[PDB]
C-alpha cells in the first residue's frame, strides 16, 4: 500500500552506446562485473561495471 | 539456485564516496534515485549521471 515503495526495480544503463538493463537476479562471478541485457535486441552479456553508465531506476 | 540472487545490492560511488542505490524507493524523477552512503548511512537524492556503478552483490 506504500505508493513510494518499489516492490521490484529495473535499473537501466548504457553500454556500448546502447540502452540496457542490469540483470539483478544473476550472480556475477566476480566483483565489479554483472550480467546485463540490451533493451533493443534482448541479448544478455557480461560487462565490467566500469564500462557501464547508470541511466534510470524504474518500477519493475 | 546458486546462480540466482534473490535480492541484490547495487554498489556505487558518488562524490568519491561508496554508496548504494535504494532500490525500493521511488525516485523523484527519471534519471534520479535515492542512494545511501556506506560510510555514514546518510540517504540522499541524486542524479544518476553523477553516480558511478561499482558492483552488484547478493542482498
Amino acid at each position: 500500500p506504500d505508493p513510494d515503495k518499489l516492490k521490484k526495480a529495473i535499473v537501466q544503463v548504457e553500454h556500448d552506446e546502447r540502452p540496457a538493463r542490469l540483470i539483478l537476479n544473476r550472480r556475477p562471478p566476480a566483483e565489479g562485473y554483472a550480467w546485463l541485457k540490451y533493451e533493443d535486441d534482448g541479448q544478455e552479456f557480461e560487462a565490467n561495471l566500469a564500462d557501464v553508465k547508470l541511466v534510470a531506476l524504474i518500477e519493475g
Side-chain angles (χ1 to χ4, degrees), chain A residues 1-6 9-60:
Chain A
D2 198 349
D4 258 9
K5 310 321 285 202
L6 297 193
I10 288 161
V11 182
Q12 296 176 304
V13 302
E14 195 184 45
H15 176 274
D16 289 350
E17 288 183 75
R18 294 167 64 184
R21 59 180 59 179
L22 292 192
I23 309 193
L24 295 171
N25 70 346
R26 286 245 177 111
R27 172 174 307 270
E31 209 152 295
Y33 298 82
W35 283 92
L36 265 64
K37 190 164 191 43
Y38 294 111
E39 300 197 316
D40 49 5
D41 65 353
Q43 293 295 316
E44 297 187 0
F45 57 105
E46 292 190 78
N48 187 319
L49 289 193
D51 294 321
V52 169
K53 171 215 255 156
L54 272 163
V55 173
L57 175 40
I58 68 176
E59 187 173 356

